[PDB]
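RETRY 2/3 - previous attempt timed out on the joint model. Re-submitting the same 614-residue input unchanged.
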Amino acid sequence: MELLFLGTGAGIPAKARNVTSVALKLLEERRSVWLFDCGEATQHQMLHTTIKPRKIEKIFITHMAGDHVYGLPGLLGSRSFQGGEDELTVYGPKGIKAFIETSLAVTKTHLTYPLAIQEIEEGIVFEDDQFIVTAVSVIHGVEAFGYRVQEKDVPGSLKADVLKEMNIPPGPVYQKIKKGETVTLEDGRIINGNDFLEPPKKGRSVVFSGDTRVSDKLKELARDCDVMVHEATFAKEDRKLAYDYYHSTTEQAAVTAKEARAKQLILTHISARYQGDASLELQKEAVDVFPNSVAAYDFLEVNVPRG
Amino acid sequence: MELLFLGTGAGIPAKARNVTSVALKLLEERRSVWLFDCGEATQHQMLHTTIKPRKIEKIFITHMAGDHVYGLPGLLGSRSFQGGEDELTVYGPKGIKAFIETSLAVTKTHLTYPLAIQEIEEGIVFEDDQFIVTAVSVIHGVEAFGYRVQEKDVPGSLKADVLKEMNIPPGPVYQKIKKGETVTLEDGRIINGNDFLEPPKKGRSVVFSGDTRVSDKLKELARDCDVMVHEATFAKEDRKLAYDYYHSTTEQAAVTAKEARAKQLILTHISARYQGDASLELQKEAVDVFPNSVAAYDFLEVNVPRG
RNA sequence: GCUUCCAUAGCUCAGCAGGUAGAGCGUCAGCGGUUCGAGCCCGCUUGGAAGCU
RNA sequence: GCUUCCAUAGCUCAGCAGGUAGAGCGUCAGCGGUUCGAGCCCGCUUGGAAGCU
Ligand SMILES: [Zn+2]
Ligand SMILES: [Zn+2]
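RETRY 2/3 succeeded.
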């Protein structure tokens, strides 16, 4: 599981930063990648990474904003252009269906795969046995969300060499044991899987605030979270500039992380008004509030380890 | 007047070539630039050129195809994002209005300028005193066009130093003369402007075939034209591969130019299946039919001089 | 970096319609182009002043 | 270059459901990871075979 930022920009593309799109790699977790927001030219950034279209299972959009979605049409099309048969679900706000649907239609684009578009709302927007992705409304205007990708706890490791020392040959009967199931051994022996198990490994969590003004909702969404990808469009001083555009300030994101007891904070969606010099300044403004902070940047990849 | 190719690709972006978009620079001609097709990330390519959004007066689309239009939303938006107040007219086929209109709407994008969208059809799609842009149907499916940008003849140079030798002080009365008008001089003198004029300078012409199969219509559209930007998706041999996808072959474009008596041919919309090595091979296949041919490539700029 | 707007005799402010350059007490920043003609229109290169959703 | 699919004892063809490796006359290409356990799942690096709207 790794975070690979494909565009850390804001408003419009700049040679320094492309418009927003953060990729959550879950290849060894579920064999795929999830994009969060897909600003224009996101597929283009990808051609510089090892992330491949067909490997994207689901795109989550934070709020309808060309710098967050003008990249869907061309991306999905490319996935179809290169084969891709798996299903892809786009999760977004009201408007996302129309946008995607119209774009393909006018372009007479027939997708060689199943496209599920879901216009979400607060609460669980996707869940299975491995992950639970809850969304929430953020301060940036009606139809704006912050997402939390929560990986559910994984089972404890199998005390395999106790099973062996008990003369229980390693084989299928093993995974049944790994599942807590009580089984009957070839020797009419009965053991309770649960007995030979290690305490469960807590699962990772990543949060994407999207575009928003300092919010208490968001604070709660990222509780104890592992990584909170937070947008910091402005420096500390421009507190007013942020409020009016419904954005946030480095120091603001940092307070948020600290208050949420998040483990790490990544500042993204930086405005071109700051330089490759200010970028470390922006970062410092945050580090003074929340030690473990990082100013995201195009192609920065941050692995998320099992704490 | 110069042709600056912003994407010479085909189907999908490649680090070598971005998807289609050719810019016709008319800065010293009418203070602006016209884009022909605006594939995704076209604005991005621009950030590497001196062409600026606000400087684009009108985008002409050849046929609805994501690799030709997924770039409008983000481009127009950016023009609005950076001020821009001049009017911008997008000329395209049926579908272009819906696409542009829906994209801005869902994104709640209010344009700080007037946007005129015109869903064209064969014939003159724009004309004034300087230019006449005629469009035509090409072989690539209903709603596919090839454009000819025809600059109208400019007036002959003023025989100024004959006017002087005739003791006619240079001043306003001059441009009236440059206009053929017969005027009355400060000394109740009467001269016929037309008399002191040089033969008119013939005006330049550029053609954009767009995506199409070898066509006789196209051949006629580019008659005597100066530059014919022609799509050559395939090499000579893949004649069948081209026919089926409604595309063209180097040799085909070259025949076309030769037959049209075009002055120069630029091969574009190259498929990634060819390399930076094949690209000169592709070009050679054409040069054997039409000497003056060039394989377009990202950021190639070709000025169009007054022959 | 991006976008836009400025560098007019000795100071301020024009020249907000290309016609040998002004109003109060001068190589119109530079090189080049368009043009009959450029401070005024288009490139390029220097120096400044805002804003960057 | 892109995408996908291959490199299984001596040849062909499996192993198209992770459980000390097969059917006709073997370091499952290599290094590393996940896992109790990997030819089989995920990276990386070598060599091939198509197609690239
Ligand atoms: Zn945004
Ligand atoms: Zn095309």
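Residues 27-29, 31, 47, 50, 52-54, 81-83, 157-161, 163-164, 169-175, 177-178, 196 of chain B lie near RNA strand C (CB under 10 Å from a C1'). Closing ticket.
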